[PDB]
Structure formats: structure tokens, C-alpha cells
Amino acid sequence: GAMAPSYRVKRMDIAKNDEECVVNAANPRGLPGDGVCKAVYKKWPESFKNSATPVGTAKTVMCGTYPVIHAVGPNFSNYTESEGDRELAAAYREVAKEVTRLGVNSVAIPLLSTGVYSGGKDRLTQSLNHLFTAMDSTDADVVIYCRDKEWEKKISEAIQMRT
Numbered sequence: 514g515a516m517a518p519s520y521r522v523k524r525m526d527i528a529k530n531d532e533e534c535v536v537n538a539a540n541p542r543g544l545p546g547d548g549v550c551k552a553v554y555k556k557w558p559e560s561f562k563n564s565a566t567p568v569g570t571a572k573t574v575m576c577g578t579y580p581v582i583h584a585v586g587p588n589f590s591n592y593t594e595s596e597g598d599r600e601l602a603a604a605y606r607e608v609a610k611e612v613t614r615l616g617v618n619s620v621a622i623p624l625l626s627t628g629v630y631s632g633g634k635d636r637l638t639q640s641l642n643h644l645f646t647a648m649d650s651t652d653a654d655v656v657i658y659c660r661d662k663e664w665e666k667k668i669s670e671a672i673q674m675r676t
């Protein structure tokens with residue numbers, strides 16, 4: 514565990530993280546995909562061996578000794594708001610299980626279902642609150658990765674609110 518488990522946010526490519534493992538915003542089929550998933554495919558392509566897993570689950574595949582946790586959020590284009598919310602909560606609970614099992618002191622994590630799976634809605638708060646519900650009971654240092662300057666500010670403010 515970390516000495517003093519913390520949450521932090523950085524605005525940069527999650528493929529350049531400084532943590533002991535990474536969460537991929539995966540598709541259910543283990544395909545290279547777009548956005549975070551394509552950056553992860555370029556950096557750790559060996560981690561996509563038998564990475565296919567259903568919506569609301571996470572599957573870890575090693576790239577050398579570096580763990581890639583493939584977490585499959587719902588695509589809100591296909592799910593109802595209600596069923597989507599349930600699956601998004603479940604994906605983060607499975608990430609917390611994997612992070613615990615691996616015994617890492619730190620993890621790099623994107624906000625699941627906030628990009629092309631958002632169904633065209635702003636889901637910063639929804640996705641971040643499910644991340645907190647899952648990860649609050651773990652002792653890994655969590656570093657959240659985003660691209661948007663305004664999202665960096667809102668994520669930072671939400672972390673600071675609880676401290």
C-alpha cells in the first residue's frame with residue numbers, strides 16, 4: 514500500500530504515466546479501438562492477448578511485468594441511463610478488485626465512458642463518483658488522467674472538496 518494513499522489528477526497521455534499499473538478504457542472485444550484504448554495499444558500491444566471481456570468487467574493482462582487492467586465501461590448510445598449507470602459502477606468495482614489482487618502501490622486511471630461511450634453527454638461527475646465509490650477502500654495512490662483543461666480543474670476541485 515501507499516504510505517498516505519492519495520488521489521491526484523494529471524492532464525496528459527495515460528501512456529506516459531508514472532504509476533505501477535494502468536487501467537485501459539477498453540472495448541469488450543480487445544480491439545485497438547480509439548482515444549485512450551489506441552494510446553494503450555501503441556504502448557503495450559502485448560497486453561491485448563486474450564483481453565476481450567464483457568461490459569462491466571475488468572481483465573488484467575501483463576506486458577512484461579507491467580499490468581494493464583482492461584476495464585469495459587458501457588456505451589451510453591446502447592444502454593439505458595439506468596442500465597448504463599449500473600454497468601459503469603460495476604466496471605470500477607472490478608478495477609478496485611484487480612488493483613488489490615496485483616498488490617500495486619499506485620494506478621493510472623482514465624474516466625470510463627466519458628469519451629466515445631458517453632452517448633454525447635458530459636459524464637465527468639457520474640464517472641468520477643463511481644471511481645471514488647470503488648477506489649476509496651483501496652490503499653493504492655490513484656492518478657486520474659484527462660485531456661481537457663476544464664476537466665482537469667473540475668476533477669482537481671472534486672478531489673480537494675473531500676480533503
Ligand SMILES: Cc1nsc(N(C)CC(N)=O)c1C#N
Pocket residue numbers: 525526527528548549552623628658659660661
Ligand atoms: C489521458 C488520455 N490519455 S490518451 C487520451 N486520449 C488519446 C483521448 C483524448 N481525449 O485525447 C486521453 C484522454 N482523455
Ligand SMILES: [Cl-]
Pocket residue numbers: 524525526529
Ligand atoms: Cl502528453
Ligand SMILES: [Cl-]
Pocket residue numbers: 538625626627628629630631
Ligand atoms: Cl469512452
Ligand SMILES: [Cl-]
Pocket residue numbers: 659660661664
Ligand atoms: Cl478528457
